[PDB]
Amino acid sequence: MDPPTFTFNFNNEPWVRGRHETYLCYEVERMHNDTWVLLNQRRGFLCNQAPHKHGFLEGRHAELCFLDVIPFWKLDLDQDYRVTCFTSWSPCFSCAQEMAKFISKNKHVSLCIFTARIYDDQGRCQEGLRTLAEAGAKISIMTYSEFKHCWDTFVDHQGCPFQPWDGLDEHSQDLSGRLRAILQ
Ligand SMILES: [Zn+2]
């Protein structure tokens, strides 16, 4: 992922101004049946698929595209895995139920979703996040740590260390208060 795209998409300044896409970075770690440790399996990122006459007519949300690729990972079906997602926006109502379905029918997948801004359409989105948590997914807001991790792991930084934008911590704190209230 190029630096301008990351910084533009994962900036946590409340404004819904220009950010019409949803980027999603994921990491997969095998549980390990004996010890306490996790094993690196794979990683990657993706974004939504805008409506297109030569593709998904009704559009393809990043969350749906993410679930589309898991089959291609070919994880041993009788093993436990940790799946972590860093998303620029939180899932819509429809994608939340879809992810909640996945983790409910699998059991061998621990899903942790870290989001930069919360997409709350003020309607059913809040309910969707409660459904995902009910399903056992960890839903949390990205802080300095998650932003830096993604920068170091998923960005072509070309050696440049991560440089936090002003207010990152502030917006991160506020969003955390809103999410905690949404859930409970
Ligand atoms: Zn969606």
Side-chain angles (χ1 to χ4, degrees):
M1 194 182 321
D2 64 298
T5 306
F6 171 75
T7 317
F8 175 73
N9 286 92
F10 286 83
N11 173 292
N12 61 3
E13 296 181 322
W15 269 180
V16 194
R17 205 265 295 167
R19 280 89 67 85
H20 303 92
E21 294 169 80
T22 293
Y23 282 74
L24 182 157
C25 310
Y26 57 85
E27 290 186 298
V28 188
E29 286 153 12
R30 190 170 154 279
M31 215 78 91
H32 195 297
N33 314 138
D34 285 46
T35 60
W36 303 40
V37 295
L38 302 156
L39 175 62
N40 314 151
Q41 297 295 313
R42 54 229 61 184
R43 60 169 49 83
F45 81 97
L46 60 89
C47 74
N48 65 290
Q49 293 305 292
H52 202 83
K53 301 178 190 290
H54 297 253
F56 307 97
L57 174 71
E58 205 69 24
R60 193 78 180 169
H61 291 177
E63 292 84 351
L64 293 183
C65 297
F66 170 60
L67 290 175
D68 294 332
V69 302
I70 298 175
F72 295 116
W73 295 346
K74 277 208 165 182
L75 311 170
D76 296 313
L77 302 185
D78 53 349
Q79 212 64 307
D80 303 315
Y81 293 89
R82 204 208 203 178
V83 183
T84 308
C85 298
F86 309 86
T87 60
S88 58
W89 284 114
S90 62
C92 85
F93 37 87
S94 174
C95 292
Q97 63 175 191
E98 213 56 48
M99 304 173 105
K101 194 179 278 60
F102 169 69
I103 60 166
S104 295
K105 301 195 186 190
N106 279 66
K107 197 185 295 182
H108 296 311
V109 172
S110 307
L111 183 62
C112 307
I113 301 300
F114 290 91
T115 184
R117 283 187 306 280
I118 269 162
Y119 175 37
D120 165 10
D121 76 331
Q122 299 162 177
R124 228 163 181 284
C125 286
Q126 292 199 25
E127 183 192 335
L129 304 184
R130 291 193 288 270
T131 302
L132 237 188
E134 189 160 324
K138 185 186 186 172
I139 310 167
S140 162
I141 304 298
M142 289 181 78
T143 50
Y144 174 79
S145 291
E146 287 73 47
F147 290 122
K148 178 191 189 272
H149 181 79
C150 294
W151 175 272
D152 297 345
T153 309
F154 298 101
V155 182
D156 193 343
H157 52 248
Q158 302 186 40
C160 295
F162 172 63
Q163 288 161 45
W165 47 85
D166 292 296
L168 179 163
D169 277 34
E170 179 165 13
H171 301 321
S172 175
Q173 178 180 55
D174 180 69
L175 285 167
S176 297
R178 300 183 191 187
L179 174 55
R180 188 229 156 293
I182 288 164
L183 271 23
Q184 291 180 29

